[PDB]
Write a protein that binds this ligand. Structure first.
Ligand SMILES: *[C@@H]1O[C@H](CO)[C@@H](O[C@@H]2O[C@H](CO)[C@@H](O[C@@H]3O[C@H](CO[C@H]4O[C@H](CO)[C@@H](O)[C@H](O)[C@@H]4O)[C@@H](O)[C@H](O[C@H]4O[C@H](CO)[C@@H](O)[C@H](O)[C@@H]4O[C@H]4O[C@H](CO)[C@@H](O)[C@H](O)[C@@H]4O)[C@@H]3O)[C@H](O)[C@H]2NC(C)=O)[C@H](O)[C@H]1NC(C)=O
Ligand SMILES: *[C@@H]1O[C@H](CO)[C@@H](O[C@@H]2O[C@H](CO)[C@@H](O[C@@H]3O[C@H](CO[C@H]4O[C@H](CO)[C@@H](O)[C@H](O)[C@@H]4O)[C@@H](O)[C@H](O[C@H]4O[C@H](CO)[C@@H](O)[C@H](O)[C@@H]4O)[C@@H]3O)[C@H](O)[C@H]2NC(C)=O)[C@H](O)[C@H]1NC(C)=O
Ligand SMILES: *[C@@H]1O[C@H](CO)[C@@H](O[C@@H]2O[C@H](CO)[C@@H](O[C@@H]3O[C@H](CO[C@H]4O[C@H](CO)[C@@H](O)[C@H](O)[C@@H]4O)[C@@H](O)[C@H](O[C@H]4O[C@H](CO)[C@@H](O)[C@H](O)[C@@H]4O)[C@@H]3O)[C@H](O)[C@H]2NC(C)=O)[C@H](O)[C@H]1NC(C)=O
Ligand SMILES: *[C@@H]1O[C@H](CO)[C@@H](O[C@@H]2O[C@H](CO)[C@@H](O[C@@H]3O[C@H](CO)[C@@H](O)[C@H](O[C@H]4O[C@H](CO)[C@@H](O)[C@H](O)[C@@H]4O)[C@@H]3O)[C@H](O)[C@H]2NC(C)=O)[C@H](O)[C@H]1NC(C)=O
Ligand SMILES: *[C@@H]1O[C@H](CO)[C@@H](O[C@@H]2O[C@H](CO)[C@@H](O[C@@H]3O[C@H](CO)[C@@H](O)[C@H](O[C@H]4O[C@H](CO)[C@@H](O)[C@H](O)[C@@H]4O)[C@@H]3O)[C@H](O)[C@H]2NC(C)=O)[C@H](O)[C@H]1NC(C)=O
Ligand SMILES: *[C@@H]1O[C@H](CO)[C@@H](O[C@@H]2O[C@H](CO)[C@@H](O[C@@H]3O[C@H](CO)[C@@H](O)[C@H](O)[C@@H]3O)[C@H](O)[C@H]2NC(C)=O)[C@H](O)[C@H]1NC(C)=O
Ligand SMILES: *[C@@H]1O[C@H](CO)[C@@H](O[C@@H]2O[C@H](CO)[C@@H](O[C@@H]3O[C@H](CO)[C@@H](O)[C@H](O)[C@@H]3O)[C@H](O)[C@H]2NC(C)=O)[C@H](O)[C@H]1NC(C)=O
Ligand SMILES: *[C@@H]1O[C@H](CO)[C@@H](O[C@@H]2O[C@H](CO)[C@@H](O)[C@H](O)[C@H]2NC(C)=O)[C@H](O)[C@H]1NC(C)=O
Ligand SMILES: *[C@@H]1O[C@H](CO)[C@@H](O[C@@H]2O[C@H](CO)[C@@H](O)[C@H](O)[C@H]2NC(C)=O)[C@H](O)[C@H]1NC(C)=O
Ligand SMILES: *[C@@H]1O[C@H](CO)[C@@H](O[C@@H]2O[C@H](CO)[C@@H](O)[C@H](O)[C@H]2NC(C)=O)[C@H](O)[C@H]1NC(C)=O
Ligand SMILES: *[C@@H]1O[C@H](CO)[C@@H](O[C@@H]2O[C@H](CO)[C@@H](O)[C@H](O)[C@H]2NC(C)=O)[C@H](O)[C@H]1NC(C)=O
Ligand SMILES: *[C@@H]1O[C@H](CO)[C@@H](O[C@@H]2O[C@H](CO)[C@@H](O)[C@H](O)[C@H]2NC(C)=O)[C@H](O)[C@H]1NC(C)=O
Ligand SMILES: *[C@@H]1O[C@H](CO)[C@@H](O[C@@H]2O[C@H](CO)[C@@H](O)[C@H](O)[C@H]2NC(C)=O)[C@H](O)[C@H]1NC(C)=O
Ligand SMILES: *[C@@H]1O[C@H](CO)[C@@H](O)[C@H](O)[C@H]1NC(C)=O
Ligand SMILES: *[C@@H]1O[C@H](CO)[C@@H](O)[C@H](O)[C@H]1NC(C)=O
Ligand SMILES: *[C@@H]1O[C@H](CO)[C@@H](O)[C@H](O)[C@H]1NC(C)=O
Ligand SMILES: *[C@@H]1O[C@H](CO)[C@@H](O)[C@H](O)[C@H]1NC(C)=O
Ligand SMILES: *[C@@H]1O[C@H](CO)[C@@H](O)[C@H](O)[C@H]1NC(C)=O
Ligand SMILES: *[C@@H]1O[C@H](CO)[C@@H](O)[C@H](O)[C@H]1NC(C)=O
Ligand SMILES: *[C@@H]1O[C@H](CO)[C@@H](O)[C@H](O)[C@H]1NC(C)=O
Lengths: 122, 104, 102, 132, 453, 132, 132, 104, 122
């Protein structure tokens, strides 16, 4: 089972950054798995964007970037999408989608990750 | 909102050493940090959840301790693949925030 | 198969009184049922599901019990009830308990 | 905590926890009480049964000591004959499912006692804001 | 202090057992081909995808499937939208005419009884004053002999004239996701070993249920949801020989069933716009339609159900199987749908073995009816129109329905006979895992806190 | 009192009493305002007419001086021209049925006067908790 | 003012004014949210959609800092990243229609901060009226 | 909840006497007591309601007086059937509560 | 007109004490009559259990025994029932159903009573 991301990276600022993360081998409708989008520009630290659970509705973000980012999730294509409107130059980064265990309800999970994709905004 | 601070920052040790990296929070979390290890251009491989019990696929050469706010990572037998990034991350309240960044 | 046994068999008593029949299934927890039958007529029901009587029968008849042990109580033995009385779960029946004028 | 170490805040999400844990996540059972040929008659009578139940509970809440306050104290002391428990064993051991069975026989005396307590306190506020 | 005080808490999660209505949901894929080509497309709404199934802890909820609700109202709901998929179709009251009818032109042998009767009759035309002589092929379970000359009539016409199915509407089951209205919740038990009643010690609350497909069968409930690892029987209770022991197994039995008689559809216009459909000519070679199952999977799955059926009856127990013993036609067979056709297949050749306590294919013949009388009401029939081509469909046998015979006085053989009977037990295996609850908030609990005046 | 010597606490139970008696039993008219083919359309429109009337009275109560309080004082003085009675003759002699006939002409001035009094008091509380 | 020199108090009547002008006439949008074969099914589902929207807004209002108060302050401070405006340009120049587009991206964070502020303040009132 | 106390308790007087039994409450009731007379193994026959007006079928040989909280029963001509129990009972607020019990 | 009470009393503790009171001659659907269940063990005082009105719904008990006792009333058999679950040894008593006048609405009533049933619980 591997998590494949997609999305080309070369764009213009104040525009439509869109990233897709999808699963191969299993499904996104498995219960109790923390989904996370976490970015990192090279030279700078690990920056947290988004995190939710697999089996509810209430979704969470970082408040310092919240007007720029939004997340989405659907199982008809098993897509896990990040949307950025009004991108600055401070989002040229590699990006990671992550499936983490919740540890009170799941001793038997596999802490899956994406490989990270590089988006460069001039 | 809870800030995290990770010390030290830039390290270079010899082989077979025992390195310690602590991190501190802004309010009391008492049970809640996870440790992640990220190599160059790669996905971060998690050391552990809940600061005292480990993940499968990782040996006993890493450890974490502490209680309350200040917590501490200890690597007792340094291997040559350890020159990478490490991060402690909180999960007390939303949003999750990582550490600063360990350049060992 | 599940065999029944009733406690008095033949009984020869007095009117006006109380009488407790006891039946004894061989595995417990059952749905117990009670029947009053006159000689040469239709048997009609007294008690379904171990406790509760039907409509249009007098309230002097009460069934009781649990587990493997079931009582059939009649208080104030009136002149009508000199009959035979059966107890049953589904596909078996008792031998037949008879209450007689003496 | 939250996230990867969470007793789960979901809908009915902590229903087997202890009442100290279920004393926090309390709006999560409130806000999922509204939302939701011959079939539309069944659908509309489901929705008006839902809002009639919610209105009866808002009206039963309001004539006691709290309008919509969601955590509400009052002015009648707690009797020993209802529970005979200590505080620590119900806030540190017992669940709300078991608690609703333990005070099941002691309903419909507490509600009439709240009604008398609130009605006498409202007439006390009436005379106390009258006489000055 | 020691004088504690009551607080009313709102929105305590507790639940109570209650009965209420429910509310449907389906996929988006059912609305792509649109507007009543299958039922319930104008009835109830598309779902939210990925049902928000959230597990609970340290709760023991007492489940029961036999005094359960919601399996009654699916049995009313299917019948109600069955009537709603049969109201705007054409009544067939002008069909009941005296038939002049013969054999189909076939090499008759004396032992085989002919399944096709070729009848010609009078029928009205679009203009009411002209009338036409038309011919059809009919199956012998739909034509009876009224009293040299052999004149026939349709079987329903001394009961009620009845309704053609429209060939717009299909018959395959789309899944229905049952879902909870506002102010109730649905609890799901998720144990493997679970035989129906008592405490389930791991529950999950869900928003909507999973995919349930309403598929009618009398014996052999098919396309059904499997178990987790073993083979489980379930019962109301076993020692009562009135309620059906229903058995559900894990690994399916693939069943191939087919009709090879190649059919031609023919339209006859009854009057104005009443396009009656009949059989036309039979081309190819006239055979008898039949079901097939593989031998080895049948032998091994019957070994698994006699292994898990011996646990309730002692280990020194001889268990054999017969076919059904009587009744009408819809309980001796297993009776099932395939792509718009009704099949009634005589399952004597499956349930016939004993067992002791120490390429390969089974075929079974199958008849075809056309007037059905679904759910055994009085004034209703659904006429199926016939479909082109060789009809072929595969399916998955999952669960069987077994009633005992009353084996008495000490001898340890206990026969089992399949016969389904009631329609609800092909749903109660599909819905044995949920119960509905009503949330009753406003708990009352003491604390050490007094309100300021 | 109650029981064998009771002016009867029933539904509309003391409607001919003096208003000092009807000032106690006041929840008994509030809580019976919720409860309760082609016929289900008539039943459905009966229940949604009931809860639309109850919601209009809750919303008309709420934007005056009280949220759900059921006994509610305010901050506009009482005029002599509306009643010209003393207090003792309306709390010691008169019934509520006759009171709704003595004031029917002076309705829809009191409600607009309450709306101005509550709106000016809300902006006074707004500026008073603003300026500090 | 009113009358012949009035910015019009009607339904939606001052909708392009400055927010200081629309801070007065505020009940005029509240009280027109209640009132209002196969056709009666459409009519009844219109009215129960109306009262379901109104009940969801009353329940969303109530679990924040105000039950029915209609002008309602709270205890979370205002962030510069939401508007970066001065007070005088939004109370002396801007319209509510243009305000709702300026702060449409900053919704569903303010409601989360309202819920945490009210829930922590209610538990602060619980522990403050507990320990005395 | 309102408690009632009935005094005296046990009596045995001669014929033709005049016995008085008082009872007191815990809060002021001012109009509300009823008097009941119970013979041995029988249903209690009511003397009176409202402490000042009698029941039909009972003569004028019984009386009750008082106002407020303390009230008083007086029997002026004792008959031989008066060897029984008597009870005053409140009806001020729910629940109703009787007296303690007379033996006379 | 007479009230007949019924119910045998020789039972085991912590069980199903049930008493019936019924009318013969008249009906229980007559308006404005206070119904009462009042018990008395011999040697002890007159103890109040229950009291209601003939023509309402709201029902009243003594709070000190309220988890044990329940009352019921129905006119299709004209029954007036007392139900005590989880009894102690302090219920060995005679029991009275009582029909009393409300004195502001009824000058013309008949203050009726039950004969009292003695229940002995070992
Ligand atoms: C238990 O579960 C199994 C698993 O699903 C199920 O088997 C399925 O049965 C259905 C019967 O309804 C089968 O569905 C039919 O399949 C044939 C063939 O489909 C294959 O080929 C097409 C390419 O043409 C592929 O796209 C497809 O994926 C398959 O590979 C179709 O021809 C059928 O469609 C016709 O019939 C429908 C009903 O009338 C029409 O709605 C549809 O538009 C098609 O109409 C055609 O025929 C009409 C008359 O002949 C004519 O008027 C039209 O113009 C048009 O020509 C239908 O899709 C399905 O394939 C089976 N699944 C598998 C894997 O084989 C069992 O039925 C189920 N058990 C029970 C009791 O339900
Ligand atoms: C469900 O499915 C099963 C099998 O799939 C069916 O079971 C078999 O059904 C047949 C009847 O349909 C049973 O009977 C056998 O039929 C033979 C047919 O011969 C006919 O024609 C000749 C000449 O025309 C006549 O003489 C004869 O009487 C028949 O009219 C019989 O010949 C068979 O006779 C047997 O016994 C005689 C002596 O007794 C011998 O001479 C024969 O050689 C032969 O051994 C026989 O009677 C058959 O037995 C059934 N099988 C089993 C295992 O019992 C079910 O009928 C079917 N049910 C339904 C409802 O569909
Ligand atoms: C159910 O029962 C119905 C009766 O109601 C049967 O219908 C008839 O079946 C027979 C047998 O096929 C048909 O007879 C054949 O008719 C062919 C065409 O005739 C039609 O067209 C001519 C004009 O060209 C008309 O005059 C005539 O009336 C018909 O309308 C003939 O060609 C056939 O001749 C055969 O033999 C010659 C010999 O040289 C060959 O050269 C030919 O190729 C051919 O093989 C024959 O006479 C009859 O027409 C049918 N009637 C109707 C109304 O359809 C059904 O057959 C039966 N069902 C089944 C399934 O068999
Ligand atoms: C359908 O299935 C079974 C078998 O026919 C039957 O279920 C039985 O239910 C009762 C209780 O639900 C079980 O009884 C238990 O058994 C022990 C034996 O030591 C007893 O102590 C108890 O039985 C009595 O106790 C109850 C109080 O606890 C009484 O209220 C009651 O009257 C019981 O008689 C204990 O509960 C019993 O074991 C099962 N049987 C099996 C085989 O598990 C059920 O009643 C059947 N239904 C019908 C309609 O036939
Ligand atoms: C039903 O399930 C819930 C969900 O798990 C459960 O709540 C939690 O249970 C666990 C254990 O079952 C509790 O964890 C321990 O509780 C004990 C006493 O309560 C504490 O002493 C423990 O503290 C230890 O751990 C610390 C850090 O590891 C040490 O520093 C310390 O020295 C102790 O050794 C530990 O917390 C947990 O507390 C509860 N949760 C809450 C909020 O109380 C619940 O108990 C289950 N209910 C039943 C009836 O089984
Ligand atoms: C379709 O409709 C036609 C038209 O009515 C039917 O034809 C008619 O059938 C009747 C039988 O009830 C015939 O009557 C009989 O005629 C014979 C002589 O042919 C006579 O000897 C008998 O005593 C009897 O009266 C009638 O003649 C016939 N009509 C014509 C014009 O000949 C026909 O039966 C219907 N069915 C089919 C399959 O065609
Ligand atoms: C279930 O299995 C048994 C075992 O074979 C079936 O019994 C057999 O059924 C056939 C069909 O009825 C009997 O054949 C005879 O055929 C002639 C032909 O017309 C008919 O006239 C006879 O009356 C009889 O039907 C066969 O004798 C019979 N065997 C026994 C021992 O009775 C049974 O029919 C099966 N049940 C079903 C519903 O298929
Ligand atoms: C035409 O069909 C009839 C029945 O519709 C057949 O007639 C009889 O069928 C039975 C079968 O149950 C046989 O036992 C009889 O021997 C048949 N009678 C005759 C005279 O054959 C008939 O076989 C079919 N074919 C023909 C040419 O008439
Ligand atoms: C269904 O199975 C459960 C457990 O698998 C049974 O429940 C208990 O089983 C144990 C094991 O023998 C017994 O000792 C208990 O007495 C059973 N308890 C109860 C309440 O039954 C259960 O009996 C089975 N029920 C049926 C109908 O098969
Ligand atoms: C039912 O039919 C399917 C296909 O219609 C059969 O599946 C085939 O089985 C043969 C035998 O092993 C294989 O060679 C084919 O490759 C299979 N094809 C497919 C598409 O699966 C199936 O075997 C039939 N069932 C039975 C019991 O024979
Ligand atoms: C049903 O069972 C019977 C016996 O119980 C089977 O009949 C025997 O089948 C074997 C297998 O060929 C033969 O060797 C015997 O001679 C048969 N005996 C009789 C009396 O027929 C029968 O085969 C079974 N049915 C099916 C469809 O398998
Ligand atoms: C079943 O019948 C249909 C029609 O009766 C047959 O379809 C024909 O197939 C050939 C193949 O080339 C076509 O040329 C014809 O045009 C088709 N007929 C029609 C009317 O369109 C079909 O072959 C038959 N199936 C089998 C298995 O025999
Ligand atoms: C019928 O049985 C077959 C196998 O006996 C089922 O096929 C498997 O279904 C799962 C779920 O989609 C797939 O992951 C497997 O790959 C399938 N097996 C094969 C060999 O392809 C099938 O789902 C069952 N149900 C239906 C409706 O056909
Ligand atoms: C409990 O209630 C009863 C009556 O309701 C009362 O007599 C008793 O004093 C109360 N006890 C406490 C501690 O409140
Ligand atoms: C509460 O009432 C039930 C019956 O209503 C009874 O069985 C149970 O014993 C009571 N609870 C307690 C703690 O006695
Ligand atoms: C019967 O078989 C089971 C295993 O299937 C075994 O556990 C049990 O002990 C056996 N009983 C006897 C009496 O041999
Ligand atoms: C009564 O109202 C009128 C106008 O509304 C006013 O002029 C008058 O002063 C008022 N009197 C009192 C006593 O409020
Ligand atoms: C109030 O108005 C009615 C008509 O609306 C009128 O007849 C009546 O006289 C008025 N009341 C008084 C006290 O004048
Ligand atoms: C605004 O919010 C962010 C995070 O929500 C915080 O870091 C910042 O300090 C806030 N600023 C003000 C002025 O409130
Ligand atoms: C608010 O969001 C929209 C898109 O949702 C975006 O186009 C717009 O620029 C944002 N507003 C501001 C002030 O950036």
């Amino acid at each position: 089972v591997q998590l494949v991301e997609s999305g080309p990276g070369v764009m213009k600022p104040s525009e439509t950054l869109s990233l897709i993360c999808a699963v191969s081998g299993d499904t996104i409708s498995s219960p109790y798995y923390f989904w996370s989008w976490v970015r990192q520009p090279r030279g700078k630290g690990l920056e947290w964007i988004g995190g939710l659970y697999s089996n509810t509705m209430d979704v969470y973000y970082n408040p310092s970037l919240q007007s720029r980012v939004t997340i989405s999730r659907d199982t008809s294509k098993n897509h896990f999408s990040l949307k950025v409107t009004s991108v600055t130059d401070t989002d040229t980064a590699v990006y990671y989608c992550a499936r983490e265990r919740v540890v009170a309800h799941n001793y038997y999970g596999l802490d899956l990750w994406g490989q990270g994709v590089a988006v460069t905004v001039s | 909102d809870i800030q995290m601070t990770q010390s030290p920052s830039s390290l270079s040790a010899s082989v077979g050493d025992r390195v310690t990296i602590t991190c501190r929070a802004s309010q009391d979390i008492k049970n809640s940090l996870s440790w992640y290890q990220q190599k160059l251009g790669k996905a971060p491989r998690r050391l552990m959840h809940h600061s005292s019990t480990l993940e499968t696929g990782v040996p006993s050469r890493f450890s974490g301790s502490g209680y309350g706010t200040e917590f501490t990572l200890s690597i007792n037998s340094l291997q040559p693949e350890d020159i990478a990034a490490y991060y402690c991350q909180q999960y007390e309240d939303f949003p999750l925030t990582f550490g600063g960044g360990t350049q060992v | 198969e599940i065999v029944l046994t009733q406690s008095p068999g033949i009984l020869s008593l007095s009117p006006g009184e109380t009488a407790t029949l006891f039946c004894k299934a061989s595995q417990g927890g059952n749905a117990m049922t009670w029947y009053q039958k006159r000689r040469g007529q239709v048997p009609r029901l007294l008690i379904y599901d171990t406790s509760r009587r039907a409509s249009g029968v007098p309230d002097r008849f009460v069934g009781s019990g649990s587990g493997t042990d079931f009582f059939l109580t009649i208080n104030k033995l009136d002149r009508e009830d000199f009959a035979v009385y059966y107890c049953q779960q589904f596909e078996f029946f008792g031998l037949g308990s008879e209450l007689e004028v003496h | 905590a939250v996230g990867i170490g969470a007793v789960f805040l979901g809908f009915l999400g902590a229903a087997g926890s202890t009442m100290g844990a279920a004393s926090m996540t309390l709006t999560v059972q409130a806000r999922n009480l509204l939302s939701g040929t011959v079939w539309g008659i069944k659908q509309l009578q489901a929705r008006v049964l839902a809002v009639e139940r919610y209105l009866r509970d808002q009206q039963l809440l309001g004539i006691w000591g709290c309008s919509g306050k969601l955590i509400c104290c009052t002015n009648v002391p707690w009797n020993s004959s209802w529970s005979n428990r200590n505080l620590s064993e119900i806030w540190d051991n017992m669940t709300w499912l078991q608690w609703d069975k333990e005070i099941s026989n002691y309903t419909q005396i507490i509600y009439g006692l709240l009604e008398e307590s609130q009605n006498q306190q409202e007439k006390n506020e009436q005379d106390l804001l009258a006489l000055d | 202090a020691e004088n504690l005080w009551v607080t009313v808490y709102y929105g305590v999660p507790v639940w109570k057992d209650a009965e209420t209505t429910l509310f449907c949901a389906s996929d988006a894929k059912a609305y792509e081909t649109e507007k009543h080509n299958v039922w319930a497309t104008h009835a109830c709404v598309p779902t939210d995808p990925n049902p928000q199934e959230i597990h609970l802890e340290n709760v023991t909820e007492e489940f029961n499937m036999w005094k359960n609700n919601m399996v009654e109202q699916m049995h009313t709901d299917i019948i109600s939208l069955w009537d709603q998929s049969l109201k705007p179709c054409v009544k067939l009251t002008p069909l009941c005419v005296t038939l002049q009818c013969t054999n189909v032109t076939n090499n008759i042998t004396d032992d085989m009884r002919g399944e096709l009767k070729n009848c010609s009759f009078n029928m009205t035309t679009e203009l009411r004053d002209k009338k036409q002589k038309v011919y059809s092929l009919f199956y012998r379970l739909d034509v009876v002999q009224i009293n040299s000359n052999k004149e026939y009539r349709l079987i329903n016409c001394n009961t009620s004239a009845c309704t053609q199915a429209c060939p717009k509407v299909s018959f395959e089951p789309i899944p229905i996701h049952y879902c909870a209205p506002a102010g109730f919740a649905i609890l799901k038990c998720k144990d493997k070993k679970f035989n129906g009643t008592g405490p389930c010690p791991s529950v999950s609350t869900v928003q909507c249920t999973h995919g349930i497909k309403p598929v009618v069968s009398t014996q052999l409930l098919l396309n059904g949801s499997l178990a987790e690892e073993e083979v489980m029987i379930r019962s109301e209770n076993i020692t009562n020989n009135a309620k059906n022991i229903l058995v559900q197994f894990n690994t399916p039995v693939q069943i191939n069933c087919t009709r090879p008689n190649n059919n031609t559809r023919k339209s006859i216009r009854i009057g104005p716009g009443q396009a009656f459909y009949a059989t036309g000519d039979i081309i190819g070679d006239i055979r008898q339609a039949h079901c097939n199952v593989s031998k080895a999977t049948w032998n091994e799955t019957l070994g698994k159900v006699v292994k898990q059926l011996r646990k309730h009856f002692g280990n020194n127990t001889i268990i054999r199987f017969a076919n059904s013993s009587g009744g009408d036609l819809e309980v001796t067979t297993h009776s099932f749908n395939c792509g718009g056709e009704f099949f009634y297949c005589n399952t004597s050749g499956l349930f016939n073995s004993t067992w002791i306590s120490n390429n390969d294919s089974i075929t079974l013949p199958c008849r075809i009816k056309q007037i059905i009388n679904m759910w055994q009401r009085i004034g209703q029939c659904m006429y199926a129109p016939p479909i082109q081509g060789v009809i072929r469909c595969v399916s998955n046998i999952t669960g069987l329905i077994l009633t005992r015979d009353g084996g008495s006085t000490n001898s340890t053989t206990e026969t089992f006979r399949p016969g389904g009977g009631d329609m609800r037990d092909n749903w109660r295996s599909e819905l044995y895992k949920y119960k509905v609850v009503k949330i009753e908030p406003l708990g009352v609990a003491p604390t050490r806190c007094k309100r300021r005046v």
